[PDB]
């Protein structure tokens, strides 16, 4: 009926995005739906560490080149990531035990990937899932080996590789303003920017269960109080796909001036890691769901 991407742009936002990759675009109706209803794409796997650098100093961009090219041929924006995070990390990186070696390896990984597509990517997720639930920093190899300074180093290196890209930190379970994790990332991002770390945005990996949409109305403005130029809703998916939960997340972005857009975790329910919860906006027939139509109604003039 109508494209939620074109409709959110009519409300002053930048995009309504979706995660995908080569294996999704070559089968089913994925390519047709993304072309019609979305305006930005994110790689699920093709830009993770294990896919781009399975051996030290030896890079590959088979899947990444495919998605970037497809986006350009079809007029879609591109987001990249995740550059520094403990998931999809080859064991050869986690086995490094000394500060300088891991720092140089981390810097070389950031620079190589961002340099390849310099000027073509809007968002780069530079650091992901860096916080524990209590607000302390996750004890990853980067924190244990390099120390707390690895987050400053990552962002400063990314800014030099492509000053045109918006540099994001992202994390999950930032969906309630009363959650210690939400308050912690706000405090640290404020201190980091005052220390010269160029963090452009905060991305909330909004993986919700039924009824958790309302809490985002007050959690998102709290995230925006960190002073970053931008914030965004990343990897959105809701168990049950209730129209009310989805509309609440859309209203949150509409009420936060610094919120630039929303990105969903996928297209069709059967292609989700938790597909048995039917958490996306398209069913097993690749047809719109009630939540999709509710977003359309919420975004019309």
Residue numbers in the entry: 3 to 303
Copied sentences from the primary study:
Here, we investigate the molecular origins of the nearly billionfold rate enhancement achieved by directed evolution of the computationally designed Kemp eliminase HG3 (7). The Kemp elimination is a well-studied model for proton transfer from carbon that has served as a benchmark for de novo design. Although the first-generation HG3 design is significantly more efficient than an “off-the-shelf” catalyst like bovine serum albumin, its specific activity was further increased 200-fold over 17 rounds of mutagenesis and screening. All HG3 variants have an inactive conformational sub-state, rooted in the original protein scaffold, which was gradually supplanted with a catalytically competent sub-state as evolution progressed.
Cryogenic structures of HG3 and HG3.7 in the absence of a ligand revealed that β-strands 6 and 7 (located adjacent to the binding pocket), adopt two distinct backbone conformations whereas only a single conformer is observed for HG3.17. One conformation matches that seen in the corresponding complexes with a transition-state analog (TSA), and presumably represents the active sub-state. The almost identical positioning of the catalytic residues in the free and the TSA-bound forms of HG3.7 indicates that the active site of this sub-state is already primed for catalysis. In the inactive sub-state, however, a backbone flip creates a steric clash between the carbonyl group of Leu236 and the nitro group of the TSA that would block ligand binding. Importantly, the NMR spectra of HG3 and HG3.7 show analogous features, although their inactive sub-states are populated to a greater extent than in HG3.17. Estimating the respective populations from the volumes of duplicated cross peaks shows that the inactive species comprises ~25% of the HG3 and HG3.7 samples at 25 °C, but only 5% of HG3.17.
